[PDB]
Amino acid sequence: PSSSMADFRKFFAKAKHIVIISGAGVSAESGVPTFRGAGGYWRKWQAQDLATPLAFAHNPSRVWEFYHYRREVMGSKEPNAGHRAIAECETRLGKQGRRVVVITLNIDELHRKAGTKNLLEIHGSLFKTRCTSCGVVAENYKSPICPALSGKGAPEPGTQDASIPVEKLPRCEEAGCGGLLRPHVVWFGENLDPAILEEVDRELAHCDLCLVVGTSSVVYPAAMFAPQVAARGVPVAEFNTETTPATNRFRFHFQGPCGTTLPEALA
Amino acid sequence: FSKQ
Ligand SMILES: [Cl-]
Ligand SMILES: [Zn+2]
User: Sorted alphabetically, which Pfam families does this protein's record hold (chain A)?
Assistant: First the structure.
């Protein structure tokens, strides 16, 4: 693909509806642990092991410790230059009657913290719960999410499992339910929300420029969004630290950290 | 679609 920043900027100056797809690279640049491919590890596992229905069915206490740890570290984490460039772009273009929407695979809410308003969080959020019995979804920012997890979730290898009885895990407060809560995060092998995908499809159908930022482009169906957009002739520009299996399908590829390339790109 |  092309690496002419000047050429991309010509499309950027004219674009009326920009879709920005962001993945784990953007969160890692804030120092958020992504637990995918260094990574690194939570004590002996990575996300592929614990973000699964199987892992939650076997040891929900261990999965909750993992998600509790991830919620807690967010206190020390701030949006990076990439998040800020993306949020400022949205505000600046919106004043010109131009639309910018972020479709993120990330679950850490740093895009919102940076001020992004048009946001589709297609894999859920560390700060939402869902009841495994009644299905209600709720926001939850409490540290710790439940008394039994207080001080738990330590990440060092060799840390014993908290082994919290399921009744002491986060419980639904819908009157009459009290079912066990899970993180409202899409796990490997689960389907994404059809209403969310309907929103995604509307944005993809109407955009005139697409950016793919910090994404490995091997997690589906998210890996396939940008290819359907190029079909209508829409330019796709990829911003990643390395090539991906989808790189040769894009109009532009700008190699490097997203917090380095995006400020120039979206200036 | 399913998350891979
Ligand atoms: Cl990703
Ligand atoms: Zn419930």
Answer: SIR2
